[PDB]
Ligand binder design. Structure first.
Ligand SMILES: [Ca+2]
Length: 180
């Protein structure tokens, strides 16, 4: 049930338009019973733990669900960028692991070198009672991210694959953006 974005004026995934802004379970994901929806202006990913998408290691993210922006249809010039950051939100502190593969017209794939993890101790209580942690993936963690970010002839991201694992059946991602 993915939905194309309606407003991508911020230049990054803020999910403030009520859509999944292109994200849905990837066709090549080893796990499919994962719900991906927009809830309260964020991308809510449900049932990761119950469905076995709970590998939190640096190298075995391959066991987790793959979520990609197949119907995003927009693009982000990331020339010179070195970081892919995002907010991870949950009703309580959780453990979350994420690996990423940004994609471009001429650079369709690169095996991530490692997944980045945020643990319960990294989550901060917010005014609304929920918890939030910042997760950052660098060009040093994703070869294809580095390839696109350093290719002056094709530094435009046109899709992206995220490997997501967690011990929680309810987490959300928000403000997924590329920065220096
Ligand atoms: Ca948002």
């Amino acid at each position: 049930q993915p939905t194309a974005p309606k407003d991508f004026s911020s230049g990054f995934w803020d999910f403030n338009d009520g859509t999944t802004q292109g994200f849905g379970v990837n066709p090549d994901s080893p796990i499919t019973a994962i719900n991906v929806e927009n809830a309260n202006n964020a991308l809510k990913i449900s049932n990761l733990n119950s469905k076995g998408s709970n590998d939190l290691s640096e190298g075995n993210f391959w066991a987790n669900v793959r979520i990609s922006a197949d119907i995003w249809g927009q693009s982000i010039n990331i020339y010179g960028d070195t970081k892919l950051t995002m907010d991870v939100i949950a009703p309580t502190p959780v453990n979350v692991s994420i690996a990423a593969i940004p994609q471009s017209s001429t650079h369709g794939w690169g095996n991530p070198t490692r997944a980045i993890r945020v643990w319960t101790n990294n989550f901060v209580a917010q005014t609304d009672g929920t918890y939030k942690a910042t997760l950052t993936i660098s060009t040093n963690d994703s070869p294809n991210f580095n390839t696109i970010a350093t290719d002056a002839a094709d530094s435009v991201v046109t899709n992206m694959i995220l490997f997501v694992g967690s011990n929680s059946d309810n987490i959300s991602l928000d403000n997924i953006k590329f920065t220096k």
